[PDB]
Amino acid sequence: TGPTQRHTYYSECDEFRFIAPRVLDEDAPPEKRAGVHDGHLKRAPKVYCGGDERDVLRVGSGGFWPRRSRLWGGVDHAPAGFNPTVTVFHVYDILENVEHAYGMRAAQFHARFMDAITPTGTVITLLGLTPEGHRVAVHVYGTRQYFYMNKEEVDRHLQCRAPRDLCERMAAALRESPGASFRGISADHFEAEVVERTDVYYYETRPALFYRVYVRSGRVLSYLCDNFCPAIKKYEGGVDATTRFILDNPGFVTFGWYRLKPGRNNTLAQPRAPMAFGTSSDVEFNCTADNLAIEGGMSDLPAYKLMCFDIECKAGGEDELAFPVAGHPEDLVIQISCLLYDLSTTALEHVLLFSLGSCDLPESHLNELAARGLPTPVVLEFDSEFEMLLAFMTLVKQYGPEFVTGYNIINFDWPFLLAKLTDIYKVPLDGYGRMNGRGVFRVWDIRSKIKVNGMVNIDMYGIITDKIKLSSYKLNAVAEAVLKDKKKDLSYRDIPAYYAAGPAQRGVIGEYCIQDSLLVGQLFFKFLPHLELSAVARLAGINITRTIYDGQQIRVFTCLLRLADQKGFILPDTRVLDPTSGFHVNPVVVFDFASLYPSIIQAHNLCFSTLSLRADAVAHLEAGKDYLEIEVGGRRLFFVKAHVRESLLSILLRDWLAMRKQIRSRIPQSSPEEAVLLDKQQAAIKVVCNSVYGFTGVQHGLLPCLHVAATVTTIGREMLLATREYVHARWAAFEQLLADFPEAADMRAPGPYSMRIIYGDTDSIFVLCRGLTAAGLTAVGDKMASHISRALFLPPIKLECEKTFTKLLLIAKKKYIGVIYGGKMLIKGVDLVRKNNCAFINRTSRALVDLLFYDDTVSGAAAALAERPAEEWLARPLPEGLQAFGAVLVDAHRRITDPERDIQDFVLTAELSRHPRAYTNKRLAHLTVYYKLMARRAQVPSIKDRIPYVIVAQTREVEETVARLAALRKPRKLLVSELAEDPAYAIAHGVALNTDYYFSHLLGAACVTFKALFGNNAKITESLLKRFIPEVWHPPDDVAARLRTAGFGAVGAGATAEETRRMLHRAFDTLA
Amino acid sequence: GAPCQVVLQGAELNGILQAFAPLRTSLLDSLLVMGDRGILIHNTIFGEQVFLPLEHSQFSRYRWRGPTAAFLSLVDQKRSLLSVFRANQYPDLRRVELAITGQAPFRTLVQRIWTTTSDGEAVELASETLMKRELTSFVVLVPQGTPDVQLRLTRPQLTKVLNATGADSATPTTFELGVNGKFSVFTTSTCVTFAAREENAKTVYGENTHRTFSVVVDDCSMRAVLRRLQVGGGTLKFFLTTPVPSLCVTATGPNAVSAVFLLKPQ
DNA sequence: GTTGGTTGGACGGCTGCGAGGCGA
DNA sequence: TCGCCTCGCAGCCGTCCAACCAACTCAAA
Ligand SMILES: [Ca+2]
Ligand SMILES: [Ca+2]
């Protein structure tokens, strides 16, 4: 008999493309050790482990890797009489597939399921685990997608008189379809019914009669919506069967615990026979939605497995240092580390290393892992790439890790593996997910996305870049920054050498591969990304896979769809705030609106459904009292208030915010693991709330309403201006402030009182508070914020006092440096220590900033610059107190020319992208250094590597040596390109650094920041900073010698004042 | 008040403007050396030493205190302290002041400018004010001593000498004064001669005409420099009793500018 | 992407050289 | 007829602006 539906993964294999590096033939003569063997081989794929040997595809007792597999190739390997009772089960993923009664005729399904797929039907497959850790698939029958069309429009077009007729029209349009890929369809495959609904767009819209059409297939739906009666607008044709299953069954979730229960006619879930299993599960069931209930009280995750994996590849072309390309047969995957964890306990359970070629892990590694209490690595050896890749995919299918992680696995590891498997080898992937065939197993580039049915891919690179700010997101840099786990890296440049050397050195590759996967596992269990993603999945009513990979829009869409249906709607298928740059030494209070855009939506009852572009829509309502009139983008818009009609968006936000408050209230009293779960929940709610605004603004998005989006920003802008005018009007004088906040009496600083808005972005205002002290001002600030909120805006709009700066450099819109009252420095929208600079410039730049903020003498002098326009400072002495800022520049200038100086502070670096002859712009510093290395002493050369250099003074010897060897394929005033030098040479010969180059780059860096002190005018800034540096003048050495022999006298110099004075008197006598 | 103060107004300002008129842009990038006796302006033109002594007495008011100060004429590598003395740079110019303030070696010069407005109102051009800190260290080498021979040439006589001067290093030129008072300048292809005498187009007035000499110069620079400076006749001043001999040419027109050329050792 | 050298071209202020005209 | 002076044109050099290459990307090997 065998499986009802054919298993398409490999369960047997007896020939394959054998590709291996020839160097593994460590017995062969040196002439035949380069390159790869590449030919077909007639034997079963093999794996070696610990001196034993096995067929990769053999299933039985002595396997080298764990299995969570019942069927293999349609053989049932379950224990004798295996028959676990299933009551409760956890769902982590949901698949959507079409089954056909004809295809399933030889499966023994109860009639009620067969009827649901006669002749075709959508089956929703819930995937997860029992409490005993049995893998389950529950196949839900009877869900149908549906869409709506306006009855009047349809009847008027197609001359339809009854729902029967419309079903004929649709069936005919599919029979007559191009490519004929629906012939066999009839009016029986449809059900049309007349319902009353309202289009979600606009207040004036009246309820109308619609046909709701049920269809048995997503394929069919997608065609009709994109081809049937194109003039007639479709509603909710985009809505998938999984969404209809979730929304049409109150309380159902895409991630959580369920219970099998009796259905209406006392129906029960039917266990499938093993030969009818659709998936790699232990048990499978058929049911309808009425056989399911959410299990309340159960919340702990079952014993799902996590696979954390990383591949290593070896470029096999003419250059072993080239980046490996999967389409090149000679560019091999040479190892795969695969760590398997229990996701519930976090325990590491297996450490597997797949190795192309023999591999002996270092004893030190083995000892270290043993000391850490981790599993002993199993090393799986293979003779060829195919055998190894097949074994790995075999593990993936047999162990079936529900969750998979790694670092850059979506953008590199998976695509590389699957390119090898699909293009080099001819392996179909469609049975390697949970489904035994015809399942989704695909990567596509956007960065990149992956979808593997039943497998939740979470790439830690994405998680970490979305969560932590870092200079580099290389895994080692991340491990230093996050785990505090400083460790060594094996360069890709090392791999080819280690690989060729033998099993001990291949073992060193293996250690570093394992260590990388161990670190990723630590990152995974630190951030627990599965918990936040599952929280969002549950809230949004979408599966965790779509949660990860689809955008923000679908989340709000699905929630809106639920509410809109409940409310009888159907969804149609598609400058005074600008800163004067400057330095403030008076305190700046930051007022921040809490969830501004969500609050506006709620306060103003904005929605698709409250909006009208027509005056006659609201002429029956009282202006102000019953609706908002507002000019937006030049149009008058009307939004009726909540008592006329309640905004759907308002309801969603209100309810989410209320839920978020309930959760955050429960946390202080929750157990340590409850605290983790509650925290993930409240965070999920925040991200969904904050997406509502964006959802309305996406032109061509799901359900756009640019009018709502524009209204939000317009109200936003007006609120900020209202906040400014209220502050300005109500608190122009200290006595007014004190009358509202009497504690201000002790806050009064000595000078003139003022309270002015100096900056405002989209949702915050900066209030400069001259004549107040910083100490009490954050507290008075929050009572100001409360008072403003009360006086100006509707709940739930809330202005809050966020922080107080004691010092603030406003540079531009979204660019500032400030010190908070606690002494901490906050930098926004600028980088002080750019990667292009040497350590000298970066350190000095930061020192100048620190001086502006932490020397009160400099701070007060810098503030004094604002009292005059920038051009005036060219003509008068700068404020006393900037002397120390000048001293840093003079010291930095002096440090460049110092013979005792560390050259390493001045080192720049540039990689060799390619051989120097292949460049167009051959005037590059690092190419100058490359040819100087060659020219002088044949110094150690470079290739695809970082050349360090220093820029050197033009000491004449540089001019003589400018004749670079590049000509084998400027003579004067040298370019920076030409004055580049090897730091080892520069150290060895005491060569002077290029003062002009380093000091101009320092003044450049300084002008990025301190330009705000002088009207944002970079030229004045550069000039005034340059003025600090001591100028000297002397005639050149040769000229000076000649003139001395001509009898000229010396003026200035080390001569005395009297000698100088007398010498000038002689000069005037001679020159007259 | 500022320790050092310099003023140009009225007749003295007119005198200075006339002195700078032929010099064009030639001195705008220069060293200004300031002390009790006045401002010595120093530059090199075509490798040759160029000087302009502005005596204290040529200014309306001149007060100096403390050490000698030296300033680069260029401010922020753009405007020159001497731009005010270009012929038409400030058409309505009325007054110029230099105030030097602070203590050595960190004194600042400020230059202020006024223009006479309608009805002769002296209005300050505040936006044109220039500010310069002194050189914190400087060395300049300067001519000294009395020349051995001086010969005063009118504008036609000097231009004849510059035409007689050699075109390149490959054709050097000789200056000679003979026992009979014959002064002559010659090179490989041309010769010019004059009758020198102690204080008619060939008559050259001078001092120490009896001191005979022969000296050589290789560079064509002497013609290029003296045309650049627009020297309309000048005194040739010969310095002979030094290891390297030297010729200083001092103008006799509005400018008192001087160029000094090294002579080939005898 | 974005930035940093560089390069190559427009152009504006300036000086020198050559030719023509006028005066002695 | 020759010399000197004045005016015009050409070469020049320094400033600025726009575009082009190229490196970090960048992180997996
Ligand atoms: Ca990886
Ligand atoms: Ca790797």
3D architecture notes:
The complex is a heterodimer of chains A (1072) and B (266). Chain A is α+β, with helices and mostly antiparallel strands. Chain A has 7 domains: 88-143 and 250-294, OB fold (Dihydrolipoamide Acetyltransferase, E2P); 148-236, no CATH class; 305-527, Nucleotidyltransferase, domain 5 (2-Layer Sandwich); 575-608 and 705-830, B family DNA polymerase, palm domain (Palm domain of DNA polymerase, Alpha-Beta Complex), CATH 3.90.1600.10; 831-898 and 1003-1027, Orthogonal Bundle (Topoisomerase I, Chain A, domain 4), CATH 1.10.132; 903-992, Orthogonal Bundle (Topoisomerase I, Chain A, domain 4), CATH 1.10.132; 1037-1071, no CATH class. Chain A has 32 helices and 41 strands. In chain A, the strands form 10 sheets. Chain A has a 7-stranded mixed sheet with strand order 15-16-9-8-7-14-17. In chain A, strands 27, 28, 32, 33, 34, 35 and 36 form a 7-stranded antiparallel sheet that branches. The longest helix of chain A is centred in the middle third of the chain and has 26 residues, at 672-697. Chain A starts with 15 loop residues before the first strand and ends with a helix. Chain B has helices at 10-20, 155-164, 221-228, and strands spanning 4-9, 31-35, 38-45, 48-55, 61-63, 69-72, 74-75, 79-80, 93-101, 108-117, 121-124, 130-133, 137-142, 149-153, 173-177, 182-186, 191-198, 203-207, 213-217, 234-239, 246-251, 258-262. Chain B has a 13-stranded mixed sheet. The longest helix of chain B is centred in the N-terminal third of the chain and has 11 residues, at 10-20. With 266 residues, chain B is mainly β. In chain B, strand 10 and strand 11 form a beta hairpin. In chain B, 11% of the residues lie in helices and 45% in strands. Chain B has 2 domains: 4-133, Box (Proliferating Cell Nuclear Antigen), CATH 3.70.10.10; 149-262, Proliferating Cell Nuclear Antigen. The A-B interface holds A 871, 874-877, 1023, 1026-1027, 1030-1035, 1040, 1042-1053, 1057, 1060-1061, 1063-1068, 1070-1072 and B 31, 33, 35-38, 40, 49, 51, 53, 55, 67-68, 70, 72, 76, 108, 110, 126-127, 129-131, 133, 135-147, 237, 239, 242-246, 248, 250, 256, 258, 260, 262. The complex binds calcium ion (CA) (2 copies). Residues 310-312, 516 of chain A line the site of one calcium ion (CA). The structure holds a DNA duplex (24 and 29 nucleotides).
